Design a binder for these strands. Structure first.
Lengths: 187, 65, 84, 437, 176, 48
RNA sequence: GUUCUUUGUAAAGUGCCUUCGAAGAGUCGAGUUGUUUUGCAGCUCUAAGUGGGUGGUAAAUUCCAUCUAAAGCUAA
RNA sequence: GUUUGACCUCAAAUCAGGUAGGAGUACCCGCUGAAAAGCGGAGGAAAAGAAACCAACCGGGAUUGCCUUAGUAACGGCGAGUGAAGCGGCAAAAGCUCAAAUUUGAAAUCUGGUACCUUCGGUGCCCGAGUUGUAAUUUGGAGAGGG
């Protein structure tokens, strides 16, 4: 076929040529156990689905329909944040405690400023592998970004050690090789 | 040729955000648009267009037999 | 026929630049790197002075005041990089 | 005499009744008939005699006698060195102009320039401003109705000269018209370069009326408000006055400590002056009370013999603080113990204290005894929108107070960790304030 | 939002990263057809300021043209190909010595989202048939040269129009 | 064009933006090492 | 005109105060070529942000004027 | 884990629903073009149209069309002759929408299928689309947050 031929010829012409160092920061990404614990963290903070939302809405609406106005109390919803402009919006306050960044986006240029932007804003970013795995934890097909701001007190101590873990595993390991021109070796 | 990237601007860290945008009211209080959707469902149930889910399970328990 | 002073309407483009947009532009500057004639241009400053640098930049550009700003910008880059 | 005896418009009469004023202070009772007479004047009066209101009354009389539109002119122009004194003069002037019909405004370096610009585009019938920002607004703002200049006043030319804005003042007066303008000015003392500006300003020939250890506590900028709270709890049932810089931080700290339910009286320029008088009266008669105030609202009124002077914020005039602690000791036979909070950037102030040659006592801090309410503070600020905005306002006005400070050798904004300052206010992230850094 | 980043990064075209992406994508598109359907706008901010929305009824075609204008001919190709679609607009993405690449937004007036949603229902009007064929697009109005200014004079088609002004004579009932 | 054909030591620089700002031209002559510089102002496409 | 209903802490407007207050780039522009009588097109180059466009103005190290391009619709 | 699954891409459907073509063509709009023809695209009109305008005034104020400007300016072997425009008077008058900073205390948005109903649609349910951004709010004449 043609499309199989092109998708195999793709990633050959990339690595054969010199990639700029603002790329290939991607795939210098998080290792196995740390990404695993990051997913264990963010599955604790799944956002509400449309079905669960509408279900709670029907519950409270049937409550008010009886009326049976039970109380007026709810702390806040805490969830991951996943809209890209919303993720950037949570930076430049700053509010992002952790950011996950997908390596694979076909318009890469949507994403390329985010490591430098969280670098200058001091936000603990981490480059995650695969936007589908982001979409799974956020009930989308893909997400390509994952910001997290608000955390319960049960999880806040896990958050800080995860931040220190990432800054040890990502910011220390890959920082100098981030500056280097990747690829260029023929296929 | 090629040479590694200079990080002159990243290495200074901003201790503050860019914009002095005032915080909105709705970030602190329970969400209004949620409640408007709630009252929409309340008006639909008052018209009976939506059946309560306890009544729905009551319907299904009889209809199964 | 005597006077009346209108409130002068200045476009919001003509007001100033924000902190946000200066941050945006400068943050784009280090990420984008240099274009190849800019890679030439920093070296041409360092080698043969701002006279020949402005002349080559004006040749690359269309006009002269843009060549001033381009040479001054690359001087800002050299000052940001070399001393710091 | 009395304010209510003299010939006045009825809204000015209602204003003076609601500000609580009936009687006159003697130097202002002297200067008011020349103030109505239309002559230029200079004057020596103590800071806070009511000398704001002294010019405020015939200025509004001139605006009442001319009745011109907001588009028509600016007229009354007020030059005042300190942003804090500007806010105090403005807050006194607001209700006075409010019963009147004309317009009132602010021009301050450190305010939003498009705000002040749009207010100038609308036109303002009574301007109160700092000297430095006026050159920017006169040289830069287009269409601003400048040609009228019905009058002009200077206050504390000693403080303009001691800051050093006098060349800016000369450029201003060379921009200013003279023939319609009359010039009135108050300065408690005088120098030659004051009199040189006076000779340019005063258009007719004027008649003029002329009438110890310190505590110092070095603390980091985050924990200083917490330590103030801790020391205030420990010294409860002792009347103490705390000196601040910005009225927003006064109102915010007062509302905060009342939310922590220990009894606190506020005292600031945004406070209504009858309510201000009520609070001062209740502090003086209650004799075991917490008083939060700025520097110059405290300067504007005599102080009862107190258990503690606490100065939290940087001073407006440190020289006046050195004279003020001396007159506080010599006036109060009851012992008033004076302390100032310090930040480890501020130790040069200490050697200026060593320039003052008065003795100094370092007051030590135990890190064990920390009240530990800062998490509750941050949860409160994340909870309450209203407290969130007042906290941001105290933070903003605090930083603009540092911006408006004279002694750069004692206070540099570049020295300060704004993260710790925000955490003292209770923000984990410092909010953006549009400040030249 | 992130669009300001994309715009400011987009203004630096010969910068190393953008020419890298450009050089990859020109070969990648060279693999494909002259005209094909792109899944998404490669320059989303430019598509936004030309009017793209991400919903059903918005089709993005990528079109290849040999080096009228090149842009208007690129619009005419996808106008001829997808006749049911109405051409909203188009923009440059990429070029080679052999070909320039354009990315064209077309809008379907048949989809009920477009037939409702009154910001865009005007394009369902049959006066908006084949705007590129009459040069009613942005590049069409530029090549026609229709603005306000003394710089804008009688040019080509309007020239025949004012030739028409010289060609026809006007007479009243009572001769003046 | 004809005048550029006349003097060989003259040059034929692309046209400047401002009819009003003229000091920059000195710098341009300094960047072209010229001892006499000539500038053509066209007001309103009619006056030279 | 009658008649039935519509509220839910729903939506909006005016004055004052306070804090902010972000916009169309292979475009602008430059050169050349063709075409037109200045635009348009192609090729090459290719920007700025108190920015830019355009025009008068000078007692001249000028001042002032006037709009916001590179997105769109609109009856008569 | 040699397994399983998310995606993403690309195919296939006698799958469902739609749509393009051709004729005519007086008027309109584009493209090409000689000594007009031709081509392409529409509608009852079309186009243009809400200033990166015109001016230099005591300024005017989207577009369109008529009278005047005017056979003037300007151009042209300044030969043949070519040939405007501002203003003024009138007809008609109408203004609006995006794209930029977060709803983040809850994508609040919509196509489609189905069941009903008062059917140029409505309600419910369910698939989907969509955060690589659909809604509300804001287009400088500001506007937004609050009070």
């Amino acid at each position: 076929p043609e499309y199989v031929r092109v998708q195999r010829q793709k990633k050959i012409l990339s690595i054969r040529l010199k990639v700029p160092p603002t790329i290939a920061q991607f795939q210098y990404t998080l290792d196995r156990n740390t990404a695993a614990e990051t997913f264990k963290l963010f599955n604790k903070y799944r956002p509400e689905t449309a079905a669960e939302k509408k279900e709670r809405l029907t519950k409270e609406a049937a409550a008010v329909a009886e009326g049976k106005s039970k109380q007026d109390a709810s702390p806040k919803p805490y969830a991951v944040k996943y809209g890209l402009n919303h993720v950037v919006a949570l930076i430049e306050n700053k509010k992002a405690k952790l950011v996950l960044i997908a390596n694979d986006v076909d318009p890469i240029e949507l994403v390329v400023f985010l490591p430098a932007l969280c670098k200058k804003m001091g936000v603990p970013y981490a480059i995650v592998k695969g936007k589908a795995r982001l979409g799974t934890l956020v009930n989308q097909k893909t997400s390509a970004v994952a910001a997290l701001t608000e955390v319960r007190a049960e999880d806040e101590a896990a958050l800080a050690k995860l931040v220190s873990t990432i800054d040890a595993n990502f910011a220390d390991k890959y920082d100098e090789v981030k500056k280097h021109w990747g690829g260029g070796i023929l296929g | 040729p090629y040479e590694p990237l200079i990080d002159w601007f990243t290495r200074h860290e901003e201790v503050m955000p860019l914009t002095a945008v005032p915080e909105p009211k709705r970030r602190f209080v329970p969400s209004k648009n949620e409640a408007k959707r709630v009252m929409k469902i309340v008006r639909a149930i008052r018209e009976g267009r939506i059946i309560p889910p306890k009544k729905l399970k009551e319907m299904k328990x009889x209809x199964x037999x | 026929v005597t006077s009346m002073t209108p409130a002068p309407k200045i476009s919001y483009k003509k007001g100033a630049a924000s902190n946000r947009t200066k941050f945006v532009r400068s943050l784009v500057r280090e990420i984008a790197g240099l274009s190849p004639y800019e890679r030439r241009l920093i070296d041409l400053i360092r080698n043969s002075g701002e006279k020949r640098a402005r002349k080559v930049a004006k040749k690359r550009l269309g006009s002269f005041t843009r060549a001033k700003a381009k040479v001054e910008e690359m001087n800002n880059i050299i000052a940001a990089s070399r001393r710091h | 005499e009395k304010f209510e005896e003299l010939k006045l418009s009825q809204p000015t009469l209602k204003a003076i009744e609601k500000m609580g004023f009936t009687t006159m202070t003697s130097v202002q009772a002297r200067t008011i008939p020349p103030l109505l007479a239309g002559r230029d004047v200079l004057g020596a009066a103590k800071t806070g005699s009511g000398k704001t209101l002294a010019f405020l009354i015939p200025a509004i009389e001139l605006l009442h006698s001319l009745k011109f539109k907001p588009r028509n002119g600016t007229g009354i122009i007020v030059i005042t060195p300190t942003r804090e004194l500007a806010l105090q003069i403005f807050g006194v002037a607001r209700e006075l102009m409010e019963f009147h019909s004309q317009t009132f405004g602010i021009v301050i370096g450190g305010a939003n320039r498009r705000q002040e610009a749009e207010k100038l585009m609308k036109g303002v019938n009574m301007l109160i401003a700092t000297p430095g920002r006026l050159l920017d607004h006169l040289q830069n703002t287009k269409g601003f109705v400048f040609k009228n200049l019905k009058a002009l006043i200077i206050d504390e030319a000693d403080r303009i000269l001691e800051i050093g804005f006098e060349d800016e003042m000369r450029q201003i007066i060379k921009i200013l018209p003279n023939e319609d303008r009359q010039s009135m000015l108050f300065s408690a003392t005088q120098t030659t370069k004051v009199e040189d500006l006076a000779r340019i300003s005063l258009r007719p020939g004027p008649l003029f009326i002329n009438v110890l250890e310190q505590g110092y506590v070095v603390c980091d900028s985050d924990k200083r408000f917490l330590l103030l709270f801790s020391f205030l709890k420990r010294n409860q049932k002792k009347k103490i006055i705390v000196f601040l810089s910005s009225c927003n931080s006064v109102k915010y700290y007062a509302e905060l400590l009342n939310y922590i339910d220990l009894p606190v009286l506020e005292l600031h320029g945004k406070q209504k002056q009858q309510k201000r008088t009520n609070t001062f009266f209740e502090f003086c008669n209650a004799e075991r009370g917490i008083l939060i105030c700025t520097d110059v609202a405290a300067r504007g009124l005599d102080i009862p013999a107190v258990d503690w002077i606490i100065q939290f914020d940087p001073p407006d005039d440190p020289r006046d603080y050195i004279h003020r602690v001396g007159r506080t000791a010599r006036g109060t036979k009851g012992k008033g113990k004076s302390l100032m909070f310090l930040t480890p950037n501020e130790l040069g102030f200490l050697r200026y204290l060593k320039a003052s040659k008065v003795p100094l006592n370092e007051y030590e801090f135990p890190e064990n005894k920390i009240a530990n309410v800062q998490s509750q503070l941050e949860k409160l600020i994340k909870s309450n929108y209203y407290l969130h905005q007042t906290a941001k306002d105290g933070y903003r006005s605090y930083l603009q107070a540092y911006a408006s400070h004279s002694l750069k050798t004692v206070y540099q904004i570049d020295k300060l960790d704004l993260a710790k300052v925000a955490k003292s206010y209770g923000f984990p992230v410092p909010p953006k304030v549009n400040i030249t850094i | 939002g992130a669009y300001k980043y994309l715009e400011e990064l987009q203004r630096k075209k010969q910068s190393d990263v953008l020419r890298f992406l450009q050089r990859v994508r020109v070969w990648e598109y060279r693999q494909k057809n002259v005209i094909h359907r792109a899944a998404r706008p490669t320059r989303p901010d430019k598509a936004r300021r030309l009017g793209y929305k991400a919903k059903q009824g918005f089709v993005i075609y990528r079109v290849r043209v040999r080096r009228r204008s090149l842009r208007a001919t690129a619009e005419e190709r996808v106008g001829r190909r997808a006749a049911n679609l109405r051409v909203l607009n188009s923009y440059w993405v990429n070029q080679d010595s052999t070909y320039k690449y354009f990315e064209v937004i077309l809008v379907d007036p048949q989809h009920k989202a477009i037939r409702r949603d009154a910001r865009y229902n005007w394009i369902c009007d049959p006066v908006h048939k084949h705007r590129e064929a009459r040069g009613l697009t942005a590049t069409g109005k530029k090549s026609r040269g229709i603005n306000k200014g003394h710089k804008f004079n009688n040019t080509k088609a309007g020239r025949r129009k004012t030739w028409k002004r010289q060609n026809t004579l006007s007479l009243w009932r009572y001769r003046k | 064009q004809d005048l550029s054909g006349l003097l060989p030591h003259s040059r034929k620089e692309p046209k400047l933006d401002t009819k009003k700002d003229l000091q920059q031209l000195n710098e341009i002559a300094e960047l072209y090492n010229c001892n006499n510089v000539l500038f053509f102002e066209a007001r309103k496409h009619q006056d030279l």
